[PDB]
Amino acid sequence: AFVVTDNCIKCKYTDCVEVCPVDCFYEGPNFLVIHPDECIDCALCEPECAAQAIFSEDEVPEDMQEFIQLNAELAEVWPNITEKKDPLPDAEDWDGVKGKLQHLER
Ligand code: SF4
Ligand code: F3S
């Protein structure tokens, strides 16, 4: 599985979904997650994300390990998303700010 990590929050560009062959992105108000059992590890979404928030599970930074199970949990409850949409307003402002987990919306 690939995993969406902190810099997605409050950015949510959603360019990542358009290349996902198996449609395994799930949408929250201000964050996206990858369903780890649906994900086929094709890696195509990783270069598409301007926030550089996507990692293969084995390369998730030590200080973002929580996002691995968070992705698996939220993918069970959020609705699938399979089409590009406009980035969040002020996405640019939040791209690169750390610890945005504190702002995650359910
Ligand atoms: S690695 Fe491939 S299958 Fe997994 S979420 Fe990214 S684009 Fe989809
Ligand atoms: S910011 Fe989030 S919505 Fe996809 S393009 Fe990057 S993982």
Side-chain angles (χ1 to χ4, degrees):
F2 276 63
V3 176
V4 183
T5 61
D6 190 91
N7 197 27
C8 175
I9 303 171
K10 280 200 171 267
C11 301
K12 193 185 171 189
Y13 293 119
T14 66
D15 295 281
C16 53
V17 306
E18 288 287 354
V19 293
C20 183
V22 289
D23 290 332
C24 59
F25 285 89
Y26 294 90
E27 187 182 3
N30 70 0
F31 185 53
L32 254 70
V33 295
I34 294 165
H35 198 309
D37 314 281
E38 292 177 0
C39 182
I40 58 164
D41 288 298
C42 76
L44 292 172
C45 51
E46 189 172 2
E48 297 305 306
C49 170
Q52 296 167 37
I54 297 188
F55 295 85
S56 66
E57 180 176 351
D58 290 354
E59 298 180 6
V60 171
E62 194 286 329
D63 73 350
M64 290 189 296
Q65 286 291 300
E66 147 69 7
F67 281 87
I68 300 175
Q69 126 179 84
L70 188 63
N71 272 233
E73 295 152 345
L74 291 170
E76 297 290 325
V77 308
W78 280 348
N80 193 204
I81 173 181
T82 67
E83 286 174 17
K84 221 276 172 241
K85 47 199 284 185
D86 297 328
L88 288 166
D90 302 313
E92 141 169 324
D93 291 2
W94 286 98
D95 189 327
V97 170
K98 298 331 190 209
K100 292 188 293 180
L101 177 56
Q102 76 182 315
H103 297 107
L104 176 64
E105 288 157 12
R106 166 86 184 241

